[PDB]
């Protein structure tokens, strides 16, 4: 198939809720080397968000079961080994996406909006690696994630209005990074509060195509604020 066919198959897969197919389709599209359209970018992002999301969810369930079975070693052993099998799937998927990010998506990003999107995505998939990293390894991974978010943050702060959904969304995920990964509720709250308030101050800048997304993300930022305090 060629670009157009793959992209249509990916849209088909999405509707069938067959996210591996969808991901595989968009991966191939990305590998033909051309800068993705906005439509393609979202299809890629959606595909892998679901593929990785299934593992993260399975990991937490199985990991929880593992910690709850201190004192039942046969069960705790079966849990651990299964957590590890799931973890390998999780890692391979993140490595898969980070690989597409270095080789294709980040170097080919022409406009600021795209560079923020991809750098945020990179922060995201290093964050997911950080969710399960033990080591002797954790630090370097955590660091890669913070650098990608930070670089993205600086570009969105320079280039985007505060109601832009890509910027609010970066603030959201970067703030989650601070709370969950760096364990700093104050830095998380600060980033989240700042982004919400700056958006509140400029609601007239909302567009027809963006305001739903923008205001939904704002609600998320405020929910995290409420939770975290």
């Amino acid at each position: 198939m060629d670009k157009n066919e793959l992209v249509q198959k990916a849209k088909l897969a999405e509707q069938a809720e067959r996210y591996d197919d969808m991901a595989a389709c968009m991966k191939s599209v990305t590998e033909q080397g051309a800068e993705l359209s906005n439509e393609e970018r979202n299809l890629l992002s959606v595909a892998y968000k679901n593929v990785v999301g299934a593992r993260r969810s399975s990991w937490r369930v199985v990991s929880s079961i593992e910690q709850k079975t201190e004192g039942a070693e046969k069960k705790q052993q079966m849990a651990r080994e299964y957590r590890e099998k799931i973890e390998t799937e999780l890692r391979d998927i993140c490595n898969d996406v980070l690989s597409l990010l270095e080789k294709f998506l980040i170097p080919n990003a022409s406009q600021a909006e795209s560079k923020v999107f991809y750098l945020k995505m990179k922060g995201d998939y290093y964050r997911y690696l950080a969710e399960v990293a033990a080591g002797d390894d954790k630090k370097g991974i955590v660091d890669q994630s913070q650098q990608a978010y930070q670089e993205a943050f600086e570009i969105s702060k320079k280039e985007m209005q505060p109601t832009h959904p890509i910027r609010l969304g970066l603030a959201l995920n970067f703030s989650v990074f601070y709370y969950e990964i760096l364990n700093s509720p104050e830095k998380a709250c600060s980033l989240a509060k700042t982004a919400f308030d700056e958006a509140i101050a400029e609601l007239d800048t909302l567009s027809e195509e963006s305001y739903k997304d923008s205001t939904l993300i704002m609600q998320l930022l405020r929910d995290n604020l409420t939770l975290w305090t």
């Binding site: 959201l172 989650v176 993300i217 939770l227």
Partner: peptide, 8 residues
């Protein structure tokens, strides 16, 4: 904690 994934 809610991330952008939680958007619908």
């Amino acid at each position: 904690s809610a991330s952008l994934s939680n958007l619908h």
